Amino acid sequence: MLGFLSARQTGLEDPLRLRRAESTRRVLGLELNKDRDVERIHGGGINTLDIEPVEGRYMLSGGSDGVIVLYDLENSSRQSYYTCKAVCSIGRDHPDVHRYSVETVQWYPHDTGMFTSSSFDKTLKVWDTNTLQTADVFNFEETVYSHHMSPVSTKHCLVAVGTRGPKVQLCDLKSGSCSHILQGHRQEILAVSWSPRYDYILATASADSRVKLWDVRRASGCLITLDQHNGKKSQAVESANTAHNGKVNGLCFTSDGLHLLTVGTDNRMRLWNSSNGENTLVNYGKVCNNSKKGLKFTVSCGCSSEFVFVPYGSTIAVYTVYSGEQITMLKGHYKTVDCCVFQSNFQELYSGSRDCNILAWVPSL
Amino acid sequence: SDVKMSLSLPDKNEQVLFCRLTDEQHKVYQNFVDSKEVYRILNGEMQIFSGLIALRKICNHPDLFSGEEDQFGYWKRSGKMIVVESLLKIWHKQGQRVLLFSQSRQMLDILEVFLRAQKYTYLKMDGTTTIASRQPLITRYNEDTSIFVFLLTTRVGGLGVNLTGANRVVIYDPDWNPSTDTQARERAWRIGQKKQVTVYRLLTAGTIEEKIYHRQIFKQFLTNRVLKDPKQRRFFKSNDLYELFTLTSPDPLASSSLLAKMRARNHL
């Protein structure tokens, strides 16, 4: 490692080289918490986690028992070993707790003064970071499997909502108009994601086993239709024709919105180009999912080679995105894992499972 | 309203006339509203189409029972036609060009017959006239001022035709859809109208026409509640029930603006 320092000081190599090499070397040596421990507040499994975008300090968390807990990750104590306290909570005694498991919770991007949450009680409440009071609600006719706010839009503030109904809702937070629906799917919609690159490109996947990249400005349904075999012929807008052979319950755009990773209940993952939906034939082998609901996973950023942290049974399985190598397996849970998040600042991973635990994986040495 | 100054249109007036039924016309209306058929309809037994259509016909003219100078559709038997004769006299003496509208083709024919009874130079258009001849007729009327009056069925008279050549406009018969009335009365006040225009919408006071007027007033209230503003005053001139069969002749955002706007939405 001293060679990198020599090259950087002499101007031989750009500091970029050392930065990304070291980040990768930290991600490879990742392992269970030597020097952290997440305070226990959830009576049930943890369905979601969302580290804030700016400054990456606070971390929401949505339990299967209706409570939301807001964490603090910075080691405010003076010891080498510490714990991540809980700052506040939408407990069970708060007048606005969800009646059921919280399925998704997301910070408001561009400002920590807000956070959105969804639940199986068909409600999408819009909280305040500071006053801690539900400053809105969108009541829906069917359970809400997942939502997502655009991560880059400075103009629009729509909130895609994938419910058990075959209609993708697009609620707005600017004056609340939850009427909009994207016609075209055929069954439940288990996951939705906004492109990080293009403002309006939404990619949804449904239990009828196809992913469809919409454009939400157009009036022509979807743009692209993802097909395992990427044959010559073309099709209209439906959920049919098998991006996967089973339910597709996962989506993630790679760090800069070019490709698109999709896990599905047929025990496969696929990397598709997101300009033309062209299955790029990376494979990853046999990744076990059998979750009946949404499956959250993430990709690293600021590392020389790009990884993906995909839950695998009760283990997190790390693959290299473009090469398909299985880098390692993280084995620290006792029940199925349901959501993992990545702390790009320090290359740390937090994982939540049905066993009511939120573990921290930190690089070693 | 926001383009008129930047477009230099002439003035417009929206006077609405409340006619008085003639003795024969009043008698016919009173007879019909006292008939058994309206009683059956009010009991829900029969379709409401027939009674409404009959009342509209009566108010337009007593043509149900075709009553010299007593030919079918004689102008003095309907008060609206007497008022129309007066206005046509005044405007012809004022050297103006008038636009005459009507919902029903048969009343348009009776009006044409009355105009032939007068010496006024007319020029008529309805669905009957061949389409190929229609635009030529529009061009003619907008060309020469010799033609005093122009006869139209509102279902073809409105709808995108330019009639700046005319000066005065009279709406003989109302309808259920106010948009028809607006299009008709806007056939005159358009781009290129070089003279002041005034609108005269004819309603037989205390009759079915007044009730239809109330209904379409409620309709403009509904539309303006969303197209112009949401603070529309509630319609109060009528409760709009099925008692129109009666005769009542007179005599990036910073997560604070978003929160505040949304709270405001929630406090209504």
Side-chain angles (χ1 to χ4, degrees):
Chain A
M1 192 223 76
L2 275 287
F4 293 111
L5 299 179
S6 289
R8 199 182 63 167
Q9 290 185 358
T10 58
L12 280 178
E13 296 293 328
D14 301 335
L16 181 134
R17 291 280 203 289
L18 182 151
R19 183 150 28 77
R20 305 204 294 173
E22 186 57 24
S23 314
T24 296
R25 193 187 78 89
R26 269 167 85 71
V27 174
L28 296 193
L30 193 57
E31 61 86 20
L32 184 69
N33 51 4
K34 296 175 303 315
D35 52 333
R36 294 185 182 179
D37 173 337
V38 190
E39 183 187 1
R40 200 169 277 93
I41 302 294
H42 278 283
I46 304 97
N47 284 316
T48 53
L49 314 164
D50 201 60
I51 301 151
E52 68 178 1
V54 304
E55 184 188 359
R57 183 181 175 156
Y58 302 117
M59 188 193 87
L60 294 164
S61 74
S64 66
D65 47 290
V67 301
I68 299 175
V69 189
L70 196 155
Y71 282 84
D72 171 30
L73 303 182
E74 279 170 6
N75 183 15
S76 291
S77 84
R78 271 84 186 288
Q79 295 81 17
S80 66
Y81 167 78
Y82 71 106
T83 48
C84 303
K85 300 293 183 182
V87 165
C88 289
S89 165
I90 307 298
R92 179 51 82 196
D93 57 354
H94 193 279
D96 309 291
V97 67
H98 290 278
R99 312 318 315 174
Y100 294 124
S101 60
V102 189
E103 269 293 321
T104 308
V105 65
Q106 205 208 6
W107 284 98
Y108 172 63
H110 320 113
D111 189 359
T112 184
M114 185 180 288
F115 67 87
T116 297
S117 65
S118 174
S119 174
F120 276 136
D121 67 22
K122 311 151 196 276
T123 64
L124 192 159
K125 310 187 172 177
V126 188
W127 305 74
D128 174 17
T129 300
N130 202 358
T131 60
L132 203 66
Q133 318 301 109
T134 61
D136 198 347
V137 182
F138 297 76
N139 295 279
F140 293 80
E141 293 82 3
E142 293 204 322
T143 66
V144 181
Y145 273 111
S146 65
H147 78 275
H148 192 237
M149 277 177 64
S150 188
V152 69
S153 176
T154 52
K155 184 266 189 188
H156 77 79
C157 192
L158 320 174
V159 187
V161 193
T163 51
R164 180 143 64 71
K167 320 295 208 324
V168 173
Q169 305 295 328
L170 278 72
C171 299
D172 200 320
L173 302 194
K174 184 185 284 288
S175 185
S177 64
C178 63
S179 77
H180 202 312
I181 69 173
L182 272 296
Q183 284 281 41
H185 266 306
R186 198 75 67 71
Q187 297 210 310
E188 309 97 4
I189 297 169
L190 302 168
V192 304
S193 285
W194 294 91
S195 166
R197 179 173 286 282
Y198 306 125
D199 274 300
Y200 296 101
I201 306 301
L202 172 79
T204 66
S206 176
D208 186 74
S209 73
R210 186 177 65 245
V211 191
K212 278 223 131 279
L213 282 79
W214 313 86
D215 186 326
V216 301
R217 288 184 305 168
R218 284 161 140 69
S220 64
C222 71
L223 298 180
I224 299 173
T225 300
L226 295 174
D227 186 13
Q228 291 175 0
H229 311 293
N230 64 10
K232 285 276 280 291
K233 318 313 181 201
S234 303
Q235 285 144 114
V237 186
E238 56 262 18
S239 300
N241 204 217
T242 77
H244 284 227
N245 302 305
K247 303 179 196 288
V248 177
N249 59 355
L251 281 167
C252 186
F253 282 76
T254 73
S255 312
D256 57 280
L258 288 180
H259 298 98
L260 173 73
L261 273 158
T262 63
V263 296
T265 58
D266 64 331
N267 297 292
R268 289 290 192 281
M269 187 169 36
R270 292 186 169 83
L271 182 67
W272 318 71
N273 164 27
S274 73
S275 183
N276 61 356
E278 188 166 2
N279 180 18
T280 66
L281 270 294
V282 187
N283 62 7
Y284 304 111
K286 189 264 187 180
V287 63
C288 298
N289 64 6
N290 58 5
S291 183
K292 291 281 205 285
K293 64 186 185 296
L295 193 160
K296 280 95 178 190
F297 64 118
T298 56
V299 287
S300 68
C301 184
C303 302
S304 73
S305 65
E306 193 159 3
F307 306 90
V308 61
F309 299 83
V310 56
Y312 177 94
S314 73
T315 63
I316 299 292
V318 186
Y319 296 77
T320 298
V321 161
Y322 298 117
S323 72
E325 272 71 351
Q326 189 173 9
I327 300 308
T328 186
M329 309 270 266
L330 309 173
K331 213 182 298 311
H333 277 280
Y334 291 103
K335 302 201 157 129
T336 66
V337 175
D338 205 307
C339 62
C340 55
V341 296
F342 183 68
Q343 166 79 286
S344 62
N345 294 337
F346 304 103
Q347 294 79 29
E348 307 167 358
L349 197 84
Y350 300 90
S351 183
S353 175
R354 311 317 308 203
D355 77 330
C356 320
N357 281 320
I358 314 188
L359 308 186
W361 319 85
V362 310
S364 80
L365 276 296
Chain B
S1 65
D2 195 16
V3 182
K4 193 258 192 188
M5 71 305 297
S6 166
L7 190 60
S8 179
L9 292 153
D11 183 38
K12 180 168 182 292
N13 293 319
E14 60 90 22
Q15 309 312 315
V16 178
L17 313 195
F18 281 89
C19 170
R20 285 85 64 192
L21 296 163
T22 59
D23 53 325
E24 181 172 0
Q25 196 170 33
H26 176 97
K27 178 173 74 67
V28 170
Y29 199 106
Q30 188 65 81
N31 192 277
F32 182 76
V33 300
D34 298 331
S35 177
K36 186 173 173 65
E37 288 77 0
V38 60
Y39 303 159
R40 297 210 304 167
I41 285 164
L42 293 170
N43 298 22
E45 312 178 9
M46 191 35 48
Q47 276 292 321
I48 299 162
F49 272 115
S50 283
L52 272 288
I53 288 154
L55 294 164
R56 286 178 93 205
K57 286 173 178 177
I58 290 158
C59 293
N60 270 11
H61 176 84
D63 54 37
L64 281 73
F65 304 149
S66 55
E68 304 204 353
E69 279 290 81
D70 63 340
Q71 291 83 11
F72 180 49
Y74 184 55
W75 65 280
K76 301 191 66 43
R77 272 188 268 129
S78 166
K80 291 215 276 172
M81 293 180 183
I82 288 157
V83 175
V84 161
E85 187 269 338
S86 176
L87 268 298
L88 289 169
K89 260 182 77 78
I90 292 162
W91 288 333
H92 200 71
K93 296 305 295 295
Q94 281 174 10
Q96 295 176 358
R97 306 189 73 200
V98 62
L99 195 61
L100 171 49
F101 276 108
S102 192
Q103 311 306 335
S104 307
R105 184 181 285 158
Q106 58 85 29
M107 210 65 38
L108 206 64
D109 283 87
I110 286 157
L111 292 156
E112 166 168 27
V113 167
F114 152 73
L115 289 165
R116 283 198 180 95
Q118 319 313 114
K119 284 69 164 202
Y120 303 140
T121 56
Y122 79 102
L123 191 58
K124 182 175 173 180
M125 293 177 70
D126 59 351
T128 63
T129 64
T130 60
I131 293 149
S133 65
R134 290 180 205 172
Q135 279 293 329
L137 279 177
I138 287 152
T139 51
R140 261 203 66 207
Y141 189 88
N142 277 325
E143 184 180 2
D144 60 347
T145 60
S146 66
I147 313 309
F148 168 54
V149 55
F150 207 60
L151 284 170
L152 293 172
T153 55
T154 50
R155 283 163 146 93
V156 165
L159 213 68
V161 299
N162 289 298
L163 277 296
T164 57
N167 187 2
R168 294 284 172 269
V169 309
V170 59
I171 298 314
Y172 182 80
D173 173 17
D175 202 292
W176 293 105
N177 304 56
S179 79
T180 305
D181 294 331
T182 65
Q183 291 209 33
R185 75 187 166 69
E186 289 288 348
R187 290 304 102 207
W189 199 45
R190 314 171 67 73
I191 282 160
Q193 172 50 231
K194 304 291 179 202
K195 296 198 179 61
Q196 195 279 332
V197 179
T198 181
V199 190
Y200 285 102
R201 296 167 76 183
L202 315 186
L203 310 166
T204 59
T207 61
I208 188 176
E209 284 189 333
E210 191 170 356
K211 303 327 186 192
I212 290 158
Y213 191 58
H214 293 172
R215 302 282 184 287
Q216 83 191 356
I217 287 156
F218 176 78
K219 287 173 177 190
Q220 288 90 19
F221 284 15
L222 179 60
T223 295
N224 303 342
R225 192 156 301 108
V226 302
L227 295 196
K228 293 341 182 183
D229 49 26
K231 289 286 193 193
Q232 175 60 25
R233 48 141 283 168
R234 290 187 293 101
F235 177 64
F236 198 69
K237 299 289 106 176
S238 290
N239 207 349
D240 287 13
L241 71 166
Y242 63 93
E243 306 314 320
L244 73 165
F245 278 103
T246 71
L247 180 52
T248 182
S249 70
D251 291 344
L253 306 156
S255 87
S256 297
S257 59
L258 202 80
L259 282 176
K261 280 184 181 184
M262 182 178 72
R263 288 197 188 87
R265 289 197 283 91
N266 278 313
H267 282 292
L268 269 296

